[PDB]
Amino acid sequence: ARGIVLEKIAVEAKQPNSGMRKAVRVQLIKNGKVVTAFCPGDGAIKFIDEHDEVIIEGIGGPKGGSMGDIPGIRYKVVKVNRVSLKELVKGRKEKP
């Protein structure tokens, strides 16, 4: 789904796992609900900024639910402004 991001939020891994996970909150262009998507990778949040077009899918948790050490987050971004996240994580391409 395609969404527009509003705010950057960092959360604490559930114990005993400790770690500051970066994620964003997005309003869906389709209907307008508000949902958080996790950003995987290293230095991902640096690319993303306020008011950014994004594309988002499900996290692939058990029954689609949460994964591992992050709580309830059901989604991850794949493309930001029609540019795929992973290569920007690799840095091969450039964000617009």
Partner RNA sequence: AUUCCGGUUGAUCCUGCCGGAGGCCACUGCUAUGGGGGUCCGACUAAGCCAUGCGAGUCAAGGGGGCGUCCCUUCUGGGACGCCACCGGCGGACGGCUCAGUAACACGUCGGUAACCUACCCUCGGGAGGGGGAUAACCCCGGGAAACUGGGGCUAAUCCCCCAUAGGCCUGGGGUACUGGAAGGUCCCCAGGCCGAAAGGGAGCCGUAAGGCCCGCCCGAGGAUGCGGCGGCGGCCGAUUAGGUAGUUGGUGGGGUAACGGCCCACCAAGCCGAAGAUCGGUACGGGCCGUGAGAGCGGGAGCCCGGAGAUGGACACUGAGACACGGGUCCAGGCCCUACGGGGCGCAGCAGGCGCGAAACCUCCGCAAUGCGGGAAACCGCGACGGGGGGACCCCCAGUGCCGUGCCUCUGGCACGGCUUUUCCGGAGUGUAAAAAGCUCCGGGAAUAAGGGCUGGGCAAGGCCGGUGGCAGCCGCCGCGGUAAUACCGGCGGCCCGAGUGGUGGCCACUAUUAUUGGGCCUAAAGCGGCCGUAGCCGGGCCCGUAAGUCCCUGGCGAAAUCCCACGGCUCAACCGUGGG
Per-residue interface string for the shown chain with RNA, residues 43-72, x marking contact by CB under 7 A: xxx---------x-xxxxxxxx--xxxx--
The interface mask with RNA, positions 3-22, x = CB under 7 A, is x------x--x--xxxxxxx
- In sequence order, the 6+-apart residues with CB closer than 8 A to the CB of 24 are 5, 6, 7, 8, 9, 36, 37, 39, 45, 48, 54, 77
Q: Applying CB under 7 A, does 37 fall inside the site for RNA? A: no
Name which of 6, 96, 24 is nearest 87 in CA terms.
96
Does 87 bind RNA (CB under 7 A)? Our answer is yes
> Residue type for 67, please?
M
Q: Count the site residues for RNA by CB under 7 A.
A: 40
Binding site for RNA (CB under 7 A): 1-3, 10, 13, 16-22, 28-30, 40-45, 55, 57-64, 67-70, 78-79, 84, 86-87, 93
